[model samples]
Target: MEEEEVETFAFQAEIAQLMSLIINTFYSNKEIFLRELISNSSDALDKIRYESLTDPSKLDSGKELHINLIPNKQDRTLTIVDTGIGMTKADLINNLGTIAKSGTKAFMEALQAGADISMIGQFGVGFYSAYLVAEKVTVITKHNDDEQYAWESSAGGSFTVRTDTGEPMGRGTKVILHLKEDQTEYLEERRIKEIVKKHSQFIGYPITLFVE
Candidate 1:
């Protein structure tokens, strides 16, 4: 297989602080991680819905705007796909690189304030929750105006983004969580179903969990 050339970006100073905050702080449970992921997915869905009103070209023609959950226990992978506002290379860097930009105020003060890290969405650190379960995370996304690209990282010092040659999802985003050895529960159909039932019933769009 031809390897894709990847570019790595170091975490900004504030992001390093947030990383330490995420790791140094505590969590009451693991299921909350998926809840935040799904919530972020829902937000993506809403984004395209509005964009489609004025610019139909914003989405792949006739591509349904929805979210897909594909859990593969055999290989130990859980992928969450959103047919929403797909990202460009710049979007990947800005959005995933650091919370410091989208976030304001003293990042250090926030980190040092003994904040509850479990509140992932509040701080726009919802994506970091993926690290709580996955040993590695991959983000493969395609925008209406751009080619497919993948972002890979362990959520430590930095992340890499590469031009993806993989099959296109047409226009959307896919977040694949490579679950850790001890994080097998996230790969369970039953466990996943239960978690979605408890926290995602409020979502406006359809959420398909593919077990077969």
Candidate 2:
């Protein structure tokens, strides 16, 4: 089996530290991670729709805007898929790499000083909350004008990006969460529905959860 050319990037110093703090300090209520992820998907869906308003070619004919939740119990993975404005390689590197870099330093200092913590969205660091439930995350995305690429990480110091060789995603992002052993509750369809209903009652987009 030939290995694909993959590029590895060390998370900026702030990101590595951010991951540890978010995983431990915020894990008391692990269910919020689902809300964070779904909110992100909703934002992405909104971006594509807004972009398509002027440039209709970006959306393929018959390709609707929506999100899909697919839970695979056997694999211990929960995948969140959305047909949205996807990322180019540079977008993947920059957007996911230097997240909330501006505020993380102050946030860390506040945490160390026991300052009242703000909501995760305040610092735009909600994405790291995925570390609370997922041991690893794989993001496959294809921008309207660029080839598909994948970015994966274990919330460790480094992450890898490579051209995707799997089935194409058309134009969107798919995030697969390799669940931690104790976080398998997120894989239940009923639980996902309740979580979405509670947190995203009016997200304004169709979010489908696959059964089986």
Candidate 3:
């Protein structure tokens, strides 16, 4: 019998420390996590739609630009899915597993120079907020130029990347967050609705919260 090969990657010592600091101390208000995720999703949808103007094939045909939130009470899981520009393996590594592309150094320089942090979206680290509420984060994404890929991380020091097993999503991405026990409030229908309205109501795309 043949044995399967395992792959691995490690974060730089400084990057690992930054991740721990952000996850443990940066944000005092827990509700900001929801806002951050929703804002990131809106940005994704907008980027995909904008790219579609020049390249119609960039977006999935007939899939409206939207964000959907599914709350599972039985499993205590909250999934936030969006039909947007999904990340490929290279993107996954550059975007999530390292600090090279997150602009942490630039952001720090800017802060020292007294630049406002509000305009940091161009650096692409917004999605990391998922680690705040989810003990485990799974991202199933399909980019226009690549096959579907699944990226899994537990907010620890490591993450795993592999081919996806589920049916293709045509185009775009889905983020499934396995909620922590103390974060169960996010699984409630009313609470989800309120959060969406408060943070994402004015977003250009449609946002739906589903509870069953």
Candidate 4:
């Protein structure tokens, strides 16, 4: 924990297929990426809330569970953060590295069989949809029982997971999307709020948007 170490891992074959499909497809509704991300944050928050019911200590400093959408035009990044049950190193690898465990094999098959983008949320593979508008994605997360770690990928067949020495995000996950040059429209506060209101109005936790 005193020093930083980074390890690289390859995305499973099925995941690579999904990544390439989502990243390169010029889906007309790219805004759905925000919906997918918000839904993910909501689920993470729900997990932490449920776990804390039995083990109160897992709540992480009594902070309220909420999601924050921070967009930085200067940096060309859109960040979606949540105070939820974050991932350990192994969790990141297993969960993000392979879609197999998430039951995405059938998802891949469905897509290859001509399924539409709407199938993304239904199959619980919306997380990778971040690639729709991002050239690269970075996930910085912390769990109650593990040190913070960051995972990064450019959809170039592999990703890197490493110890995070940056400012601690307490217990949760922060997803930063490095928006592609042409996708910078997502960096606007109005655009994100509209997407949130349209597709994520049902999410229980508060979702706040901050533009920089």
- How many residue pairs clash in model 3? 0
Q: Best candidate per TM-score, number? A: 4
Best by lDDT: 4
* TM-scores vs. true structure, each candidate: 0.88, 0.90, 0.82, 0.94
How well is each residue in 102-172 modelled by candidate 1, as lDDT tens digits?
55234345646875556557767678778778878899988776778998877577878999988867777
Weakest 10 consecutive residues of candidate 1 by summed lDDT = 99-108
Give the runs in model 3 whose Cα sits over 4 Å from its true position: 1-6, 25-28, 60-62, 95-102, 106-123
Q: How do the candidates rank by TM-score, highest first? A: 4, 2, 1, 3
Which lDDT tens digits does candidate 2 get at residues 38-114? 88888888998988899888788226989898999999999989888888898888865456676677667766887
Worst 10 residues of 2 by lDDT: 115-124
Tell me the tens digit of each residue's lDDT in model 4 across 108-165. 7777799888678888778888999999999999998789999999998898999998
For candidate 3, write residues 1-212 as lDDT tens digits.
Answer: 64333345566555555455456644444555667677777877888888989988775543589888888988878888888887778887775545443465665565568754343444555555566677887888888778788888776777778888677787677888898777789888888888778766798888888758
RMSD, every candidate, angstroms: 2.5, 2.2, 3.4, 1.8
| Clashing pairs for predicted structure model 3, backbone only | none
Worst 10 residues of 4 by lDDT: 95-104
The clash numbers for all candidates, in the given order, read 0, 0, 0, 0
lDDT of 1: 0.77
Q: Report residue 45 deviation for candidate 2 (angstroms).
A: 1.1
